[PDB]
Amino acid sequence: DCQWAAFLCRVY
Amino acid sequence: AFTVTVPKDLYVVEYGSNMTIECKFPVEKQLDLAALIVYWEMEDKNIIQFVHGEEDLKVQHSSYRQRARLLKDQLSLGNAALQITDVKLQDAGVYRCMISYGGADYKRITVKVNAPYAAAL
Ligand SMILES: *CC(=O)Nc1ccc(NC(=O)C*)cc1
Ligand SMILES: [N]
């Protein structure tokens, strides 16, 4: 998932 | 592992009503805002962006601004609850909750919008 991918970056 | 679960992964909601779809995440001790991040999206539209308690009306996609909110009281129960008022036919589709809280996971929820013939609409 691209949304999932972007979400892990911003958080971690 | 930190697991997010959904009580319903399919919702049928009345046209013109309010809907609340829910994602559950584990909260053992008292909920720590400093550790909690919640994102709700659907079809690349940003709906909720909740960072350690911080939110910003501006990042919310225009089709959901003033209609969509995270129910704050529910978080301390381990319930990420998205409420959308005045449900439209364009709201049917697939929603994603993404939660970070000592670990990270996400679930998809499918929403169907119906218009019962004897309902308010
Ligand atoms: C498919 C895709 O979009 N992957 C993607 C998007 C954004 C990011 N952001 C960061 O890495 C910080 C990663 C992967
Ligand atoms: N990180």
PDB file of C-alpha atoms and ligand atoms in Angstrom:
ATOM      1  CA  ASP A   1       0.000   0.000   0.000  1.00  0.00           C
ATOM      2  CA  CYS A   2       1.328   3.480  -0.860  1.00  0.00           C
ATOM      3  CA  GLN A   3      -0.767   5.153   1.846  1.00  0.00           C
ATOM      4  CA  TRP A   4       0.478   2.535   4.312  1.00  0.00           C
ATOM      5  CA  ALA A   5       4.027   3.125   3.103  1.00  0.00           C
ATOM      6  CA  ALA A   6       3.845   6.907   3.508  1.00  0.00           C
ATOM      7  CA  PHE A   7       2.246   6.476   6.949  1.00  0.00           C
ATOM      8  CA  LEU A   8       5.133   4.390   8.290  1.00  0.00           C
ATOM      9  CA  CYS A   9       7.655   6.998   7.144  1.00  0.00           C
ATOM     10  CA  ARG A  10       5.948  10.009   8.749  1.00  0.00           C
ATOM     11  CA  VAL A  11       5.594   8.032  11.954  1.00  0.00           C
ATOM     12  CA  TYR A  12       8.960   6.265  12.090  1.00  0.00           C
TER      13      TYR A  12
ATOM     14  CA  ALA B   1       2.172  -7.989  17.720  1.00  0.00           C
ATOM     15  CA  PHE B   2       0.112  -4.815  17.941  1.00  0.00           C
ATOM     16  CA  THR B   3      -3.068  -5.735  16.045  1.00  0.00           C
ATOM     17  CA  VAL B   4      -5.867  -3.434  14.863  1.00  0.00           C
ATOM     18  CA  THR B   5      -9.231  -5.206  14.451  1.00  0.00           C
ATOM     19  CA  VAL B   6     -12.616  -4.178  13.017  1.00  0.00           C
ATOM     20  CA  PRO B   7     -15.953  -5.297  14.550  1.00  0.00           C
ATOM     21  CA  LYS B   8     -17.590  -4.833  11.152  1.00  0.00           C
ATOM     22  CA  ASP B   9     -15.594  -4.671   7.978  1.00  0.00           C
ATOM     23  CA  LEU B  10     -18.769  -3.901   5.997  1.00  0.00           C
ATOM     24  CA  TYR B  11     -21.266  -1.173   6.892  1.00  0.00           C
ATOM     25  CA  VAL B  12     -24.587  -0.342   5.258  1.00  0.00           C
ATOM     26  CA  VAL B  13     -25.470   3.259   6.149  1.00  0.00           C
ATOM     27  CA  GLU B  14     -28.576   5.249   5.326  1.00  0.00           C
ATOM     28  CA  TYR B  15     -28.300   8.072   2.816  1.00  0.00           C
ATOM     29  CA  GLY B  16     -28.494  11.369   4.679  1.00  0.00           C
ATOM     30  CA  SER B  17     -27.815   9.849   8.123  1.00  0.00           C
ATOM     31  CA  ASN B  18     -24.719   9.866  10.330  1.00  0.00           C
ATOM     32  CA  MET B  19     -22.292   6.962  10.319  1.00  0.00           C
ATOM     33  CA  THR B  20     -19.549   5.846  12.672  1.00  0.00           C
ATOM     34  CA  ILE B  21     -17.065   3.203  11.526  1.00  0.00           C
ATOM     35  CA  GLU B  22     -14.652   1.814  14.101  1.00  0.00           C
ATOM     36  CA  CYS B  23     -11.162   0.370  14.406  1.00  0.00           C
ATOM     37  CA  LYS B  24     -10.078  -1.210  17.689  1.00  0.00           C
ATOM     38  CA  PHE B  25      -6.524  -1.054  18.976  1.00  0.00           C
ATOM     39  CA  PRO B  26      -5.205  -2.409  22.294  1.00  0.00           C
ATOM     40  CA  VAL B  27      -4.995   0.001  25.256  1.00  0.00           C
ATOM     41  CA  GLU B  28      -3.830  -1.700  28.491  1.00  0.00           C
ATOM     42  CA  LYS B  29      -2.581   1.120  30.697  1.00  0.00           C
ATOM     43  CA  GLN B  30      -4.077   4.587  30.610  1.00  0.00           C
ATOM     44  CA  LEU B  31      -4.033   5.875  27.031  1.00  0.00           C
ATOM     45  CA  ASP B  32      -0.870   7.844  26.211  1.00  0.00           C
ATOM     46  CA  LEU B  33      -1.519  10.679  23.758  1.00  0.00           C
ATOM     47  CA  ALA B  34       2.224  11.113  23.228  1.00  0.00           C
ATOM     48  CA  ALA B  35       2.353   7.609  21.654  1.00  0.00           C
ATOM     49  CA  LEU B  36      -0.857   7.660  19.559  1.00  0.00           C
ATOM     50  CA  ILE B  37      -1.167   8.426  15.848  1.00  0.00           C
ATOM     51  CA  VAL B  38      -4.397   7.733  13.920  1.00  0.00           C
ATOM     52  CA  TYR B  39      -4.951   8.224  10.159  1.00  0.00           C
ATOM     53  CA  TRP B  40      -8.187   7.655   8.290  1.00  0.00           C
ATOM     54  CA  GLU B  41      -8.227   7.712   4.509  1.00  0.00           C
ATOM     55  CA  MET B  42     -10.384   6.573   1.606  1.00  0.00           C
ATOM     56  CA  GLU B  43      -9.275   6.363  -2.053  1.00  0.00           C
ATOM     57  CA  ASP B  44      -6.277   8.645  -1.419  1.00  0.00           C
ATOM     58  CA  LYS B  45      -8.435  11.301   0.324  1.00  0.00           C
ATOM     59  CA  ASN B  46      -7.060  12.295   3.739  1.00  0.00           C
ATOM     60  CA  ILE B  47      -9.923  12.191   6.264  1.00  0.00           C
ATOM     61  CA  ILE B  48      -8.337  12.122   9.749  1.00  0.00           C
ATOM     62  CA  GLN B  49      -4.740  12.918  10.708  1.00  0.00           C
ATOM     63  CA  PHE B  50      -4.315  12.733  14.481  1.00  0.00           C
ATOM     64  CA  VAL B  51      -0.733  13.067  15.681  1.00  0.00           C
ATOM     65  CA  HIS B  52      -0.184  12.801  19.451  1.00  0.00           C
ATOM     66  CA  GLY B  53      -3.449  14.722  19.805  1.00  0.00           C
ATOM     67  CA  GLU B  54      -2.693  17.233  17.035  1.00  0.00           C
ATOM     68  CA  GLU B  55      -5.070  17.811  14.129  1.00  0.00           C
ATOM     69  CA  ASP B  56      -5.363  20.418  11.408  1.00  0.00           C
ATOM     70  CA  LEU B  57      -8.590  21.184   9.552  1.00  0.00           C
ATOM     71  CA  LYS B  58      -6.572  22.191   6.486  1.00  0.00           C
ATOM     72  CA  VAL B  59      -5.119  18.753   5.653  1.00  0.00           C
ATOM     73  CA  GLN B  60      -8.626  17.227   5.670  1.00  0.00           C
ATOM     74  CA  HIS B  61      -9.845  16.585   2.120  1.00  0.00           C
ATOM     75  CA  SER B  62     -12.510  19.109   1.165  1.00  0.00           C
ATOM     76  CA  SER B  63     -15.191  16.469   0.577  1.00  0.00           C
ATOM     77  CA  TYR B  64     -14.947  15.542   4.272  1.00  0.00           C
ATOM     78  CA  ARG B  65     -14.099  18.840   5.991  1.00  0.00           C
ATOM     79  CA  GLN B  66     -16.990  19.813   8.289  1.00  0.00           C
ATOM     80  CA  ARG B  67     -18.465  16.301   7.939  1.00  0.00           C
ATOM     81  CA  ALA B  68     -15.809  13.986   9.402  1.00  0.00           C
ATOM     82  CA  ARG B  69     -14.299  13.795  12.870  1.00  0.00           C
ATOM     83  CA  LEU B  70     -12.489  11.385  15.156  1.00  0.00           C
ATOM     84  CA  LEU B  71     -14.519  10.711  18.294  1.00  0.00           C
ATOM     85  CA  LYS B  72     -11.993  11.734  20.977  1.00  0.00           C
ATOM     86  CA  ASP B  73     -13.798  10.154  23.952  1.00  0.00           C
ATOM     87  CA  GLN B  74     -13.574   6.746  22.251  1.00  0.00           C
ATOM     88  CA  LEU B  75      -9.770   6.680  21.997  1.00  0.00           C
ATOM     89  CA  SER B  76      -9.155   5.979  25.684  1.00  0.00           C
ATOM     90  CA  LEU B  77     -11.281   2.832  25.176  1.00  0.00           C
ATOM     91  CA  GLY B  78      -9.014   1.672  22.347  1.00  0.00           C
ATOM     92  CA  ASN B  79     -11.637   2.661  19.768  1.00  0.00           C
ATOM     93  CA  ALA B  80     -10.680   4.763  16.746  1.00  0.00           C
ATOM     94  CA  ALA B  81     -14.174   5.910  15.701  1.00  0.00           C
ATOM     95  CA  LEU B  82     -14.652   7.943  12.513  1.00  0.00           C
ATOM     96  CA  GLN B  83     -17.970   9.746  12.397  1.00  0.00           C
ATOM     97  CA  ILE B  84     -19.236  11.267   9.163  1.00  0.00           C
ATOM     98  CA  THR B  85     -22.418  13.335   9.259  1.00  0.00           C
ATOM     99  CA  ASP B  86     -24.896  13.623   6.364  1.00  0.00           C
ATOM    100  CA  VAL B  87     -23.874  10.522   4.444  1.00  0.00           C
ATOM    101  CA  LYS B  88     -23.798  10.949   0.663  1.00  0.00           C
ATOM    102  CA  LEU B  89     -23.903   8.380  -2.113  1.00  0.00           C
ATOM    103  CA  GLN B  90     -20.312   9.368  -2.951  1.00  0.00           C
ATOM    104  CA  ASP B  91     -19.258   8.164   0.538  1.00  0.00           C
ATOM    105  CA  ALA B  92     -19.667   4.470  -0.343  1.00  0.00           C
ATOM    106  CA  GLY B  93     -16.361   2.696  -0.873  1.00  0.00           C
ATOM    107  CA  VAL B  94     -13.359   1.498   1.137  1.00  0.00           C
ATOM    108  CA  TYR B  95     -11.882   3.283   4.165  1.00  0.00           C
ATOM    109  CA  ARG B  96      -8.482   2.666   5.800  1.00  0.00           C
ATOM    110  CA  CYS B  97      -7.697   3.190   9.454  1.00  0.00           C
ATOM    111  CA  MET B  98      -3.950   3.281  10.216  1.00  0.00           C
ATOM    112  CA  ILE B  99      -2.960   3.337  13.891  1.00  0.00           C
ATOM    113  CA  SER B 100       0.434   3.705  15.567  1.00  0.00           C
ATOM    114  CA  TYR B 101       0.565   2.931  19.290  1.00  0.00           C
ATOM    115  CA  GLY B 102       3.598   0.936  20.382  1.00  0.00           C
ATOM    116  CA  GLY B 103       3.456  -0.804  17.029  1.00  0.00           C
ATOM    117  CA  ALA B 104       1.472  -0.141  13.888  1.00  0.00           C
ATOM    118  CA  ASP B 105      -1.300  -1.791  11.852  1.00  0.00           C
ATOM    119  CA  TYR B 106      -4.248  -0.918   9.662  1.00  0.00           C
ATOM    120  CA  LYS B 107      -7.586  -2.308   8.496  1.00  0.00           C
ATOM    121  CA  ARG B 108      -9.890  -1.687   5.565  1.00  0.00           C
ATOM    122  CA  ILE B 109     -13.593  -1.017   6.064  1.00  0.00           C
ATOM    123  CA  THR B 110     -16.137  -1.145   3.236  1.00  0.00           C
ATOM    124  CA  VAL B 111     -19.135   1.192   3.430  1.00  0.00           C
ATOM    125  CA  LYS B 112     -22.328   0.701   1.383  1.00  0.00           C
ATOM    126  CA  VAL B 113     -24.787   3.615   1.171  1.00  0.00           C
ATOM    127  CA  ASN B 114     -28.442   2.629   0.823  1.00  0.00           C
ATOM    128  CA  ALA B 115     -31.633   4.722   0.681  1.00  0.00           C
ATOM    129  CA  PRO B 116     -34.485   2.850   2.382  1.00  0.00           C
ATOM    130  CA  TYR B 117     -37.781   3.861   0.813  1.00  0.00           C
ATOM    131  CA  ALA B 118     -39.436   4.703   4.143  1.00  0.00           C
ATOM    132  CA  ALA B 119     -36.327   6.307   5.679  1.00  0.00           C
ATOM    133  CA  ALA B 120     -35.624   9.980   6.201  1.00  0.00           C
ATOM    134  CA  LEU B 121     -32.928  10.685   3.563  1.00  0.00           C
TER     135      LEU B 121
HETATM  136  C1  LIG C   1       3.792   3.405  -3.566  1.00  0.00           C
HETATM  137  C2  LIG C   1       4.315   4.522  -2.664  1.00  0.00           C
HETATM  138  O1  LIG C   1       3.779   5.572  -2.714  1.00  0.00           O
HETATM  139  N1  LIG C   1       5.462   4.314  -1.781  1.00  0.00           N
HETATM  140  C3  LIG C   1       5.981   5.325  -0.859  1.00  0.00           C
HETATM  141  C4  LIG C   1       5.420   6.585  -0.730  1.00  0.00           C
HETATM  142  C5  LIG C   1       5.922   7.503   0.188  1.00  0.00           C
HETATM  143  C6  LIG C   1       7.001   7.183   1.000  1.00  0.00           C
HETATM  144  N2  LIG C   1       7.495   8.154   1.985  1.00  0.00           N
HETATM  145  C7  LIG C   1       8.721   8.002   2.772  1.00  0.00           C
HETATM  146  O2  LIG C   1       9.434   7.076   2.608  1.00  0.00           O
HETATM  147  C8  LIG C   1       9.149   9.024   3.826  1.00  0.00           C
HETATM  148  C9  LIG C   1       7.540   5.911   0.887  1.00  0.00           C
HETATM  149  C10 LIG C   1       7.040   4.994  -0.025  1.00  0.00           C
HETATM  150  N     N C   2      11.296   6.336  13.166  1.00  0.00           N
END
